[PDB]
Design a protein around this nucleic acid. Structure first.
Ligand SMILES: [K+]
Ligand SMILES: [K+]
Ligand SMILES: [K+]
Ligand SMILES: [Mg+2]
Ligand SMILES: [Mg+2]
Ligand SMILES: [Mg+2]
Ligand SMILES: [Mg+2]
Ligand SMILES: [Mg+2]
Ligand SMILES: [Mg+2]
Ligand SMILES: [Mg+2]
Ligand SMILES: [Mg+2]
Lengths: 343, 17, 63, 51, 132, 225
RNA sequence: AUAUACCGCCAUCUUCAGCAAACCCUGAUGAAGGCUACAAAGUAAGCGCAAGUACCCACGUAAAGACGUUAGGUCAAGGUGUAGCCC
């Protein structure tokens, strides 16, 4: 009857079943979720099936300076309004269904390598338009509770960089994935590192550190070598601005230890000026391309030492078998020096 | 098919003291 | 912005680099005073460790 | 691929500005196909135009 | 737990009105009544006929002013007269409001054989009491 | 066109002199020795990063070398005087209840701020919420006592470094001076020494504040004519 | 038909006192965690308790009583998603 009729809000609230026991603990499949539709969007007050034209409501009150009278559309004319209304509905529905093209990361369904944009602007006139955010890891962590039981939480690792030596990472934890992206992104700009770059394209020297159980052996390379490193390192290096470098990860491939160890070793690298000041000597660069010419890249600001460093017949420096095995043509691997895309 | 995820429009705080 | 990495470097080094990178549009008021009249030791965090074996403190008794 | 998706990009020996994008500016070496993504047919036509 | 006429708490972005923010145990302490007639007084009659008229009026005005009602109706009866008081949004043009006022007043006077008068109070946006 | 002259003459000029405010005449090594500024804690309490400043241990009682204190205190007073000349916010922190009254009075006397009470977590690293978005944090934090009541470093020492705030601190023989930008090695327990420190920082600040009013009046008067 | 799709109205713990957005910090930036008043990292809008109010007061009794828990109860109040019947 007419007294057993509810409102749209009550009908959709019960039809969607958004708030229910099933939603609470992963008890409902999302393959075919029901979707709310507004059935009043394209409705005009005064338009009915009979095709009546109400002056002042459906149609203009006055025509040619005189008040109109009650009129009713003809069958042919009213049938053309229903079909044109349908086309509007289909057009609206079609546009919503269409999906805008997206840019994938490392994998199609992987969050890693996806950009989150610049961090949110600060209240006190602070902006980070020159920074870029890139996701490294999105984990779904669970915790047993007394009442709810097994509740789902999101842990997100992101890195931010301006491309000119400034970069940082952070962790975001929340129940919604969109809230974890904001926290990590906005908190990474308050924990920024400054990475020194040799000629603005690579590190000053070969780095070989170990964070906990993760081993990272980076190498300095010339221009045009490109980035031949772990995909996560390639994301961070672009953020820092390192064009050319080689890196190998051994041990545990934990993203957080690989991220916390990379920023640690790239911040503790000695430049050529520091080396000169520390030893009061000239740092001379020798290149095969330039032959025997000595290129002075740094000189001490203080008193230049008059005595040379004592030559060492043999140096007691720990070597790496992986590097010695490669130079002597003994490291056979069908996965090294493979043709890949530009990084 | 991949899961379709796009950045949602940021909300504006409604409740102010 | 800034940098809350108290363990990494010192305030002078962290501010000197970010100001040169562009992150900090204006350098802090104290920055000029530190460069002109710096301290004897750069304030870098260092973790205290325990002495082991035969290592001993240099402190001598005043007799 | 980059050369086949645009019909206005003509691999000719007179189009030096397009051939410089497939040669390293630091080593003067023609990139392999997987680097740029071009097909074997166009990579073989670039090498001839670059030579 | 009790559910009747209660808006459950949310993250904080849900705006509720004064009437919608109070439960039934405040109906005579912090709230009034949306309808005022004599049917329910001691020794009065026709309480079942005034109630059906109220239920129909709220649905008639809700579908006759779609999307324009900020708050619930306040129905008033004084003798023969019936006064409908409503708060409405300013989105709709005045021409359409005057039309619906002259149409609704007249139709409801011939349906309930009584003089019906409708008093609109436009507001820019739905008055917000607090955010639950 | 007029700012460059104002900045160069007023701000840059003091930074060109070794002792613009002459804070070396405010104290001496004998003035510190009479205030028991060399008396430290026992050897068992000694901290490992205060060994360079320890002259020795007389009968298990560390003696702080006053020759370094004078050199360390000169840099702190000059830095403290320059930041007051620049109209900087100086905050005094001390959790020793015995001297809480004295420190609060001096701050009011020298037109500066104090916090001798329990440090609520977030004063500095969360000031926007606690005070407001447009809040201005201190430009210089002076630690008269770097340790708390359970003999551990004050939380502000670590929180002031996160906010890139320069710190001045009176470190004893059981204190950590690693995050203190300008550390003065001296006794922080005797009441005869804390009265000296307070009197010295209060004198350097009042001088600097009055020194800028003299430089401005000259510029203002000279500028008109 | 399905209360194991739901709204709606409830039971129960509740003869409880906690829930929680947004920040901050710790743990080497692991899951996690976050107090000491002679105080040692927490600050907190909002909801609830509380307070008010009703009945004969300040008392007491009502009422109220969050978030959650038990896929608790109810498709047979009514409405309704899905599926099914239509001589
Ligand atoms: K239910
Ligand atoms: K039913
Ligand atoms: K049903
Ligand atoms: Mg795929
Ligand atoms: Mg009950
Ligand atoms: Mg002491
Ligand atoms: Mg149930
Ligand atoms: Mg009571
Ligand atoms: Mg009860
Ligand atoms: Mg109560
Ligand atoms: Mg059941």
């Amino acid at each position: 009857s007419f007294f057993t009729k509810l409102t749209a809000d009550e009908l959709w609230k019960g039809a969607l079943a958004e708030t229910g026991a099933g939603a609470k603990k992963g008890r409902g499949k999302r393959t075919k979720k029901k979707k709310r539709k507004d059935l009043n969007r394209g409705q005009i007050i005064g338009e009915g099936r009979y095709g009546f034209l109400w002056p002042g409501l459906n149609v203009p009150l006055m025509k040619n300076g005189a008040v109109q009278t009650i009129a009713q559309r003809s069958k042919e004319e009213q049938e053309k309004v229903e079909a044109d209304m349908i086309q509007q509905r289909e057009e609206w529905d079609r546009k919503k269904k269409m999906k805008v093209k997206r840019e994938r990361g490392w994998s199609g369904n992987s969050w890693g390598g996806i950009s989150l944009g610049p961090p949110d602007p600060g209240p006190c006139g602070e902006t980070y338009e020159d920074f870029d955010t890139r996701i490294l890891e999105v984990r779904n962590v669970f915790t047993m509770t007394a009442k709810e039981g097994r509740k789902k939480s999101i842990r997100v690792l992101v890195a931010v960089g301006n491309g000119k030596g400034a970069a940082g990472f952070s962790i975001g934890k929340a129940t919604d994935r969109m809230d974890a992206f904001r926290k990590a992104k906005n908190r990474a700009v308050h924990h920024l590192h400054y990475i020194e770059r040799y000629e603005d394209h690579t590190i000053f020297h070969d780095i070989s550190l170990r964070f906990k159980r993760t081993h990272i052996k980076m190498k300095k390379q010339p221009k045009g070598y490109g980035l031949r490193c772990h995909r996560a390192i390639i994301t961070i290096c672009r953020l820092i601005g390192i064009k050319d470098m080689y890196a190998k990860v051994s041990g545990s491939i934990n993203m957080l230890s690989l991220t916390q160890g990379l920023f640690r070793g790239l911040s503790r690298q000695e430049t050529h000026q520091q080396l000169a000041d520390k030893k009061g000597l000239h740092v001379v660069e020798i290149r095969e391309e330039c032959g025997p010419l000595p290129i002075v890249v740094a000189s001490p600001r203080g008193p230049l030492r008059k005595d040379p460093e004592p030559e060492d017949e043999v140096p007691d420096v720990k070597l790496d078998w992986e590097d010695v095995k490669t130079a002597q043509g003994m490291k056979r691997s069908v996965w090294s020096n493979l043709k890949r895309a530009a990084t | 098919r991949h899961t379709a995820f796009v950045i949602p429009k940021k909300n504006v705080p409604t409740s102010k003291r | 912005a800034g940098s809350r990495l108290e363990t990494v470097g010192s305030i002078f080094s962290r501010t000197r680099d970010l100001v040169r990178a562009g992150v900090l549009k204006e350098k802090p008021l104290w920055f000029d005073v530190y460069d002109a009249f710096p301290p004897l030791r750069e304030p870098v965090f260092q973790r205290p460790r325990v002495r082991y074996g035969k290592a001993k403190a240099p402190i001598q008794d005043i007799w | 691929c980059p050369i086949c998706r645009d019909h206005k990009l003509h691999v000719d020996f007179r189009n030096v500005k397009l051939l410089e994008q497939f040669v390293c500016a630091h080593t003067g070496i023609i990139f392999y196909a997987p680097y740029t993504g071009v097909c074997v047919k166009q990579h073989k036509r670039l090498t001839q135009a670059i030579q | 737990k009790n559910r009747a006429a209660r808006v459950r708490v949310s993250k904080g972005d849900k705006p509720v009105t004064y009437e919608e923010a109070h439960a039934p145990h405040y109906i005579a302490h912090r709230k009034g009544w949306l309808s005022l007639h004599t049917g329910n007084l001691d020794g009065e009659d026709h309480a079942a006929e005034r109630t059906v008229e109220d239920v129909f009026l709220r649905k008639f005005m809700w579908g006759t002013f779609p999307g324009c009602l900020a708050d619930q109706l306040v129905l008033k009866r004084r003798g023969n007269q019936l006064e409908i008081c409503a708060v409405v949004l300013r989105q709709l043009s005045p021409h359409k409001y005057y039309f619906l006022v002259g149409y609704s007043e007249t139709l409801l006077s011939y349906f309930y054989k009584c003089p019906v008068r409708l008093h609109l109070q436009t507001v820019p946006s739905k008055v917000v009491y607090k955010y639950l | 066109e007029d700012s460059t002259d104002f900045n160069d003459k007023i701000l840059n000029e003091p930074l060109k002199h070794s002792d613009f405010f002459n804070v070396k005449e405010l104290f001496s090594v004998r003035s510190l020795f009479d205030a028991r500024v060399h008396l430290g804690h026992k050897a068992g309490c000694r901290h490992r990063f205060m060994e360079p400043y320890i002259f020795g241990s007389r009968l298990d009682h560390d003696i702080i070398d006053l020759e370094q204190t004078a050199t360390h205190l000169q840099l702190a007073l000059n830095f403290t005087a320059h930041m007051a000349y620049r109209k900087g916010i100086i905050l005094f922190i001390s959790r020793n209840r015995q001297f809480s009254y004295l420190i609060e009075n001096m701050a009011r006397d020298c037109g500066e701020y104090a916090h001798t009470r329990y440090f609520r977590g977030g004063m500095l690293t969360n000031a926007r919420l606690l005070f407001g978005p447009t809040v201005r944090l201190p430009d210089l934090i002076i630690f008269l006592h770097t340790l708390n009541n359970i003999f551990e470093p004050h939380v502000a020492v670590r929180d002031a470094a996160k906010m890139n705030i320069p710190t001045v601190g009176i470190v004893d023989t059981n204190c950590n001076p690693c995050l203190i930008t300008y550390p003065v090695p001296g006794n922080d327990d005797s009441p005869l020494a804390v009265h000296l420190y307070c009197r010295l920082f209060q004198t350097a600040i009042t001088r600097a504040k009055e020194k800028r009013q003299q430089v401005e009046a000259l510029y203002r008067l000279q500028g008109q004519k």
